[PDB]
Design a binder for this molecule. Structure first.
Ligand SMILES: CCc1ccc([C@H]2C[C@@H](C(F)(F)F)n3ncc(C(=O)NCc4ccc(F)cn4)c3N2)cc1
Ligand SMILES: CCc1ccc([C@H]2C[C@@H](C(F)(F)F)n3ncc(C(=O)NCc4ccc(F)cn4)c3N2)cc1
Ligand SMILES: CCc1ccc([C@H]2C[C@@H](C(F)(F)F)n3ncc(C(=O)NCc4ccc(F)cn4)c3N2)cc1
Lengths: 234, 244, 241
């Protein structure tokens, strides 16, 4: 009900189907996406294409099931080509970064608005981001909610190519003709670059402090009222 | 004496004021910067802009006439420790060349807004010196490992243009631009910023020298080549290196 | 017999001279390179230029003591890694497979306009050592490394310059003039910086799952299918076993 699944050649296309909420991840969508990734190998598919219906790839969230989704993607023997058709924001950016490769629409952008919201990310989100946009641009994205445009994303390697869903499927079909064991090996080693990192004690303290703070409430109220937030640092 | 401090909106601008030596660091200047970083939170500032007076951001280290030159490297370590530990984001307004200790200082900032005119350089290979591990790892994270090799192995200058390319510069801009950005950042959720800063700084750049590193670090600093480079500059002639 | 060694100023130029096979590595070529790197400091040189004769820098591994060859190759990298001399790779053409590994083991790279770099391992069903993957990642950026490794995509010289894999675009002559400058720098500064830069964590032992997948790749029928398909000029039909 929340995703579409089709297969052409040896490519499985999984489409996020909550366009009315710009494909925000809820429970049912996260669960169905998990099952789809897990069952992806059951037929004859050798590559996956992951994309969103409508104008957004994924506008955010709407932690346990979510963590299991990332685990399923990280553990999958098949390469996932993200056809990032539009904005990938927050949990949506996380999802885009968990893809093995990325084909990005010219109007798509990437963003962690966490500093606007008073929240804090897990270490993997931060490390994978630094690896993909470079540490310097990661600092700006993390510390000041900077948007990463399709064009800058191509410049840094966050986007592998700029193009359409059709382009992503053409590339996925090529990839599906390559040697699956070579692909599996390279995927495992690359994912084990150290991005998958347990929070240090001081990170967890700061994480819990941010999440449990009064500023989280102030950010929601100001955004809901479309007015500038008066944060307190508590 | 050697630094200026103003506050506007919620931005604390700290200005290195030793323009006669192109803002080159020594004992006193480093001490006064440390204090200013540490005190920066007392009022209601939520961001720091760090910049230099005149044509230079910081051209390195001088130490001649410095009564406590011996304590310089330790006080410099303390400055870096204070910037790392500071809850506020530091926006480096790199108004001009950042060389040696100045590039280190620029890299310790959280964000960088760079003058079209500025460049970054580690001239260590010209002087026979060796860098701490952090300097090498933070540079690699900022310019990419490939460019970091050319910078360290051949004293390659990094222009503002290429700095923007790689991410070393987040923006090419003036002090004014840096300050407007800092004003925006000072309006974001301080506790989110605190978390991200700590995680980002804990990427592993802060790394203890391995035993072979320390061995090579001491051979370089202890070498006659270091003396030769200083003499050569002073005599305005190419240095004749010996590898000892 | 299989390398050329010349010295001008304080720059030793080592030339891979097997152009008929696009400078592909075999035991004798690896052994002679190893010796040339090891003894490069015996005279008065303080910088090394490494380059290929003809159109290619190094197209890969040949073999056609070939069971005593992966060991010899590891030794070449060790000697390059341990060398006090900075090695400027003049990448005069394609660097592929073991050629790409060799190019990355260089301290700096000056790359010809028509040169490209490539790991075609996913086309052949093979798996790389961890270092090849980590060092590639550091040089082209994690994103591009993913495309190169999961899809065998080539990296052109212009993109190499963009990422830092190429420090400059230029000729062998450019690389030699650059090396002559570096040879006038302080050797102990260079030695330290090289050691730390190489000790970035790229020299990584394979994790358990890395080794499992690596052995499974190298022992698979798919390696065979890849070869037979090339010899039959036809699409491979891999089985994932
Ligand atoms: C194996 C591949 C893999 C599996 C999971 C992740 C991320 C995904 C991200 C999600 F997408 F789910 F949002 N995510 N969100 C929260 C967490 C998380 O790890 N929480 C524990 C924690 C406690 C305290 C603290 F301070 C920091 N972290 C987490 N892991 C990345 C890669
Ligand atoms: C936590 C935040 C933080 C604190 C300090 C640093 C750097 C700054 C740099 C300076 F800017 F000061 F120059 N710097 N310079 C020298 C050292 C240093 O630590 N020396 C001990 C040592 C001995 C032998 C060896 F081989 C290498 N290192 C050192 N630390 C970076 C981050
Ligand atoms: C100190 C500087 C240094 C020395 C050697 C290397 C690489 C070079 C590369 C070559 F260019 F030779 F091909 N190479 N090839 C194979 C191996 C290797 O170490 N294999 C063991 C292994 C076990 C399990 C597994 F899963 C993968 N590999 C290996 N090491 C890198 C840096």
């Amino acid at each position: 009900h929340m995703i579409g699944i089709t297969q052409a050649e040896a490519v499985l296309t999984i489409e996020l189907q909550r366009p009315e909420r710009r494909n925000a991840l809820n429970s049912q969508l996260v669960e169905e996406l998990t099952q789809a990734i897990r069952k992806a190998g059951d037929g004859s598919a050798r590559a996956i294409v992951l994309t969103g219906q409508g104008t957004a790839f994924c506008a955010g969230a709407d932690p346990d099931r979510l963590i299991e989704l990332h685990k399923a993607m990280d553990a999958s023997p098949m390469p996932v080509v993200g056809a990032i058709n539009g904005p990938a924001i927050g949990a949506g950016l996380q999802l885009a970064m968990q893809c093995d490769l990325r084909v990005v629409a010219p109007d798509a952008f990437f963003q962690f608005p966490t500093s606007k919201y008073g929240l804090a990310l897990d270490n993997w989100s931060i490390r994978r981001l630094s690896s993909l946009v470079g540490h310097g641009r990661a600092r700006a994205m993390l510390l000041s909610a900077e948007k990463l445009t399709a064009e800058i994303a191509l410049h840094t390697g966050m986007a592998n190519r700029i193009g359409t869903l059709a382009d992503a499927q053409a590339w996925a079909a090529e990839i599906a003709r390559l040697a699956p064991l070579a692909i599996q090996h390279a995927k495992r080693v690359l994912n084990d670059d150290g991005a998958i990192e347990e929070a240090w004690p001081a990170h967890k303290e700061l994480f819990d402090k941010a999440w449990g703070s009064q500023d989280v409430i102030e950010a929601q109220v100001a955004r809901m009222e479309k007015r500038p937030p008066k944060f307190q640092g508590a």
